[PDB]
Amino acid sequence: ALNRIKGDDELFVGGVFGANRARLIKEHRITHILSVIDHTVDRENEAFRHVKHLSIDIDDMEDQDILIHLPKIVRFIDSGLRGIAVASPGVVLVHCAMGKSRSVTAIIAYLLWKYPYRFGKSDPNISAKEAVSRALEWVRETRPIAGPNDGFMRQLEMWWDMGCPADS
Protein backbone atom coordinates (compact mmCIF):
# COMPACT_ATOMS: atom_id res chain seq x y z
CA ALA A 1 0.00 0.00 0.00
CA LEU A 2 0.78 3.61 -0.15
CA ASN A 3 -0.03 4.95 3.32
CA ARG A 4 -1.19 8.47 4.12
CA ILE A 5 0.78 10.27 6.83
CA LYS A 6 -1.34 11.33 9.85
CA GLY A 7 -2.30 14.97 9.81
CA ASP A 8 -3.55 17.63 7.45
CA ASP A 9 -1.15 17.10 4.54
CA GLU A 10 -1.93 14.87 1.59
CA LEU A 11 1.41 13.14 2.00
CA PHE A 12 1.95 9.42 1.28
CA VAL A 13 4.75 6.91 1.82
CA GLY A 14 5.46 3.52 0.36
CA GLY A 15 7.81 1.15 -1.37
CA VAL A 16 8.76 0.65 -4.97
CA PHE A 17 6.13 -1.87 -6.06
CA GLY A 18 3.38 0.46 -4.83
CA ALA A 19 4.99 3.55 -6.34
CA ASN A 20 4.98 1.83 -9.74
CA ARG A 21 1.29 0.86 -9.54
CA ALA A 22 -0.68 3.27 -11.77
CA ARG A 23 -3.86 2.17 -9.99
CA LEU A 24 -2.63 3.45 -6.63
CA ILE A 25 -1.25 6.70 -8.03
CA LYS A 26 -4.72 7.31 -9.51
CA GLU A 27 -6.57 6.16 -6.35
CA HIS A 28 -4.77 8.69 -4.17
CA ARG A 29 -4.64 11.37 -6.90
CA ILE A 30 -0.88 11.63 -6.47
CA THR A 31 0.67 14.52 -8.44
CA HIS A 32 4.25 14.52 -7.13
CA ILE A 33 6.61 11.61 -6.50
CA LEU A 34 9.86 11.90 -4.50
CA SER A 35 11.97 8.77 -5.01
CA VAL A 36 14.50 8.52 -2.18
CA ILE A 37 16.17 5.90 -4.37
CA ASP A 38 17.27 5.80 -7.94
CA HIS A 39 14.02 5.54 -9.89
CA THR A 40 12.48 6.41 -13.26
CA VAL A 41 8.69 6.86 -13.67
CA ASP A 42 6.94 5.27 -16.69
CA ARG A 43 5.97 8.33 -18.71
CA GLU A 44 4.25 6.14 -21.31
CA ASN A 45 1.61 5.31 -18.70
CA GLU A 46 -1.05 8.04 -18.50
CA ALA A 47 -0.98 7.85 -14.70
CA PHE A 48 2.64 9.01 -14.65
CA ARG A 49 2.84 11.16 -17.79
CA HIS A 50 2.43 14.48 -15.98
CA VAL A 51 3.64 13.67 -12.45
CA LYS A 52 6.33 15.94 -11.02
CA HIS A 53 9.24 13.62 -10.20
CA LEU A 54 12.50 13.93 -8.23
CA SER A 55 14.83 10.95 -7.70
CA ILE A 56 17.82 10.90 -5.37
CA ASP A 57 20.30 8.06 -5.77
CA ILE A 58 20.96 6.78 -2.24
CA ASP A 59 21.21 3.36 -0.65
CA ASP A 60 19.72 2.24 2.62
CA MET A 61 22.99 1.99 4.51
CA GLU A 62 24.22 3.66 7.69
CA ASP A 63 27.18 5.29 5.85
CA GLN A 64 25.04 7.00 3.26
CA ASP A 65 24.74 10.80 3.52
CA ILE A 66 21.05 11.73 3.46
CA LEU A 67 21.53 14.93 5.52
CA ILE A 68 23.03 16.66 2.47
CA HIS A 69 19.77 16.04 0.60
CA LEU A 70 17.33 17.07 3.28
CA PRO A 71 16.90 20.75 2.25
CA LYS A 72 16.05 19.78 -1.34
CA ILE A 73 13.83 16.92 -0.10
CA VAL A 74 11.86 19.15 2.27
CA ARG A 75 11.49 21.91 -0.37
CA PHE A 76 10.17 19.32 -2.87
CA ILE A 77 7.55 17.98 -0.45
CA ASP A 78 6.50 21.41 0.79
CA SER A 79 6.29 23.01 -2.65
CA GLY A 80 4.38 20.03 -4.05
CA LEU A 81 1.84 20.21 -1.20
CA ARG A 82 1.41 23.99 -1.41
CA GLY A 83 1.29 24.07 -5.20
CA ILE A 84 3.79 26.85 -5.89
CA ALA A 85 -0.20 31.95 -11.11
CA VAL A 86 -2.96 30.43 -8.95
CA ALA A 87 -1.55 27.85 -6.53
CA SER A 88 -2.65 24.27 -7.17
CA PRO A 89 -2.01 22.21 -4.02
CA GLY A 90 -0.67 18.76 -4.85
CA VAL A 91 -0.58 15.25 -3.46
CA VAL A 92 2.92 14.01 -2.68
CA LEU A 93 4.16 10.39 -2.56
CA VAL A 94 7.58 9.78 -1.03
CA HIS A 95 8.82 6.27 -1.72
CA CYS A 96 11.93 4.09 -1.61
CA ALA A 97 12.32 0.31 -1.86
CA MET A 98 10.52 -0.92 1.22
CA GLY A 99 8.87 2.28 2.42
CA LYS A 100 10.78 1.68 5.67
CA SER A 101 14.03 3.64 5.90
CA ARG A 102 14.96 6.01 3.04
CA SER A 103 11.47 7.45 2.32
CA VAL A 104 10.56 7.55 6.02
CA THR A 105 13.69 9.57 6.77
CA ALA A 106 12.65 12.11 4.14
CA ILE A 107 9.13 12.35 5.61
CA ILE A 108 10.46 12.74 9.14
CA ALA A 109 12.77 15.54 7.95
CA TYR A 110 9.75 17.34 6.52
CA LEU A 111 7.63 16.74 9.64
CA LEU A 112 10.37 18.04 11.98
CA TRP A 113 10.80 21.11 9.77
CA LYS A 114 7.10 21.87 9.41
CA TYR A 115 5.79 20.89 12.89
CA PRO A 116 8.62 21.39 15.40
CA TYR A 117 6.27 22.14 18.32
CA ARG A 118 4.43 18.87 17.76
CA PHE A 119 7.70 16.99 18.35
CA GLY A 120 8.84 19.07 21.34
CA LYS A 121 10.44 22.33 20.12
CA SER A 122 10.31 23.68 23.68
CA ASP A 123 9.95 21.33 26.41
CA PRO A 124 13.46 22.51 27.26
CA ASN A 125 14.73 19.02 28.04
CA ILE A 126 13.70 17.97 24.57
CA SER A 127 16.61 16.11 22.99
CA ALA A 128 17.10 15.62 19.26
CA LYS A 129 16.84 11.87 19.81
CA GLU A 130 13.47 12.35 21.51
CA ALA A 131 12.16 14.71 18.81
CA VAL A 132 13.14 12.32 16.03
CA SER A 133 11.64 9.40 17.94
CA ARG A 134 8.34 11.19 18.31
CA ALA A 135 8.26 11.94 14.55
CA LEU A 136 9.05 8.30 13.80
CA GLU A 137 6.21 7.12 16.06
CA TRP A 138 3.93 9.61 14.30
CA VAL A 139 4.79 8.03 10.95
CA ARG A 140 4.33 4.53 12.44
CA GLU A 141 0.68 5.35 13.18
CA THR A 142 -0.07 4.74 9.48
CA ARG A 143 3.18 3.10 8.23
CA PRO A 144 3.95 0.61 11.00
CA ILE A 145 7.04 -0.88 9.24
CA ALA A 146 8.72 2.57 9.33
CA GLY A 147 12.23 2.37 10.71
CA PRO A 148 15.19 4.35 9.39
CA ASN A 149 18.57 2.76 9.68
CA ASP A 150 20.85 3.85 12.59
CA GLY A 151 22.87 6.29 10.45
CA PHE A 152 19.77 7.98 9.10
CA MET A 153 18.47 8.30 12.68
CA ARG A 154 21.72 10.03 13.66
CA GLN A 155 21.48 12.39 10.67
CA LEU A 156 17.89 13.29 11.53
CA GLU A 157 19.15 14.28 14.97
CA MET A 158 21.76 16.44 13.23
CA TRP A 159 18.98 17.94 11.06
CA TRP A 160 16.98 18.90 14.18
CA ASP A 161 19.99 20.30 16.02
CA MET A 162 20.90 22.41 12.93
CA GLY A 163 17.42 23.93 13.14
CA CYS A 164 16.09 22.07 10.06
CA PRO A 165 17.60 24.54 7.58
CA ALA A 166 15.55 23.93 4.39
CA ASP A 167 16.00 27.44 2.90
CA SER A 168 18.04 27.62 -0.32
PDB file of C-alpha atoms in Angstrom, residues 59-120:
ATOM      1  CA  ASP A  59      21.214   3.365  -0.651  1.00  0.00           C
ATOM      2  CA  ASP A  60      19.719   2.237   2.624  1.00  0.00           C
ATOM      3  CA  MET A  61      22.987   1.985   4.510  1.00  0.00           C
ATOM      4  CA  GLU A  62      24.216   3.664   7.686  1.00  0.00           C
ATOM      5  CA  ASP A  63      27.183   5.289   5.853  1.00  0.00           C
ATOM      6  CA  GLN A  64      25.044   7.002   3.259  1.00  0.00           C
ATOM      7  CA  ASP A  65      24.745  10.798   3.519  1.00  0.00           C
ATOM      8  CA  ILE A  66      21.048  11.726   3.462  1.00  0.00           C
ATOM      9  CA  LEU A  67      21.526  14.927   5.517  1.00  0.00           C
ATOM     10  CA  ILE A  68      23.030  16.660   2.472  1.00  0.00           C
ATOM     11  CA  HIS A  69      19.767  16.042   0.598  1.00  0.00           C
ATOM     12  CA  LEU A  70      17.327  17.069   3.280  1.00  0.00           C
ATOM     13  CA  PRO A  71      16.900  20.753   2.252  1.00  0.00           C
ATOM     14  CA  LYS A  72      16.046  19.775  -1.335  1.00  0.00           C
ATOM     15  CA  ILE A  73      13.829  16.922  -0.099  1.00  0.00           C
ATOM     16  CA  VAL A  74      11.857  19.147   2.272  1.00  0.00           C
ATOM     17  CA  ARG A  75      11.487  21.909  -0.367  1.00  0.00           C
ATOM     18  CA  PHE A  76      10.171  19.322  -2.874  1.00  0.00           C
ATOM     19  CA  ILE A  77       7.548  17.975  -0.452  1.00  0.00           C
ATOM     20  CA  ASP A  78       6.496  21.413   0.795  1.00  0.00           C
ATOM     21  CA  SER A  79       6.286  23.009  -2.650  1.00  0.00           C
ATOM     22  CA  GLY A  80       4.379  20.029  -4.050  1.00  0.00           C
ATOM     23  CA  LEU A  81       1.839  20.207  -1.198  1.00  0.00           C
ATOM     24  CA  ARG A  82       1.406  23.993  -1.413  1.00  0.00           C
ATOM     25  CA  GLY A  83       1.291  24.071  -5.201  1.00  0.00           C
ATOM     26  CA  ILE A  84       3.793  26.847  -5.888  1.00  0.00           C
ATOM     27  CA  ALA A  85      -0.203  31.949 -11.115  1.00  0.00           C
ATOM     28  CA  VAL A  86      -2.962  30.429  -8.954  1.00  0.00           C
ATOM     29  CA  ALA A  87      -1.547  27.849  -6.531  1.00  0.00           C
ATOM     30  CA  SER A  88      -2.646  24.268  -7.167  1.00  0.00           C
ATOM     31  CA  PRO A  89      -2.008  22.212  -4.017  1.00  0.00           C
ATOM     32  CA  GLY A  90      -0.673  18.756  -4.852  1.00  0.00           C
ATOM     33  CA  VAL A  91      -0.576  15.252  -3.458  1.00  0.00           C
ATOM     34  CA  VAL A  92       2.921  14.011  -2.676  1.00  0.00           C
ATOM     35  CA  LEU A  93       4.157  10.395  -2.559  1.00  0.00           C
ATOM     36  CA  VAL A  94       7.583   9.777  -1.028  1.00  0.00           C
ATOM     37  CA  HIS A  95       8.815   6.268  -1.722  1.00  0.00           C
ATOM     38  CA  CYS A  96      11.932   4.093  -1.607  1.00  0.00           C
ATOM     39  CA  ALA A  97      12.322   0.315  -1.860  1.00  0.00           C
ATOM     40  CA  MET A  98      10.517  -0.924   1.222  1.00  0.00           C
ATOM     41  CA  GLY A  99       8.872   2.282   2.416  1.00  0.00           C
ATOM     42  CA  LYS A 100      10.779   1.681   5.668  1.00  0.00           C
ATOM     43  CA  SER A 101      14.035   3.638   5.904  1.00  0.00           C
ATOM     44  CA  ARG A 102      14.958   6.006   3.043  1.00  0.00           C
ATOM     45  CA  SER A 103      11.474   7.453   2.320  1.00  0.00           C
ATOM     46  CA  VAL A 104      10.557   7.552   6.016  1.00  0.00           C
ATOM     47  CA  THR A 105      13.691   9.567   6.767  1.00  0.00           C
ATOM     48  CA  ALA A 106      12.647  12.106   4.140  1.00  0.00           C
ATOM     49  CA  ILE A 107       9.132  12.345   5.606  1.00  0.00           C
ATOM     50  CA  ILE A 108      10.458  12.736   9.135  1.00  0.00           C
ATOM     51  CA  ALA A 109      12.774  15.538   7.953  1.00  0.00           C
ATOM     52  CA  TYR A 110       9.755  17.341   6.519  1.00  0.00           C
ATOM     53  CA  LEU A 111       7.630  16.736   9.643  1.00  0.00           C
ATOM     54  CA  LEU A 112      10.374  18.040  11.977  1.00  0.00           C
ATOM     55  CA  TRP A 113      10.796  21.109   9.767  1.00  0.00           C
ATOM     56  CA  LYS A 114       7.095  21.866   9.409  1.00  0.00           C
ATOM     57  CA  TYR A 115       5.792  20.885  12.891  1.00  0.00           C
ATOM     58  CA  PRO A 116       8.618  21.394  15.405  1.00  0.00           C
ATOM     59  CA  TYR A 117       6.275  22.136  18.319  1.00  0.00           C
ATOM     60  CA  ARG A 118       4.426  18.874  17.757  1.00  0.00           C
ATOM     61  CA  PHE A 119       7.699  16.989  18.350  1.00  0.00           C
ATOM     62  CA  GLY A 120       8.844  19.069  21.335  1.00  0.00           C
TER      63      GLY A 120
END
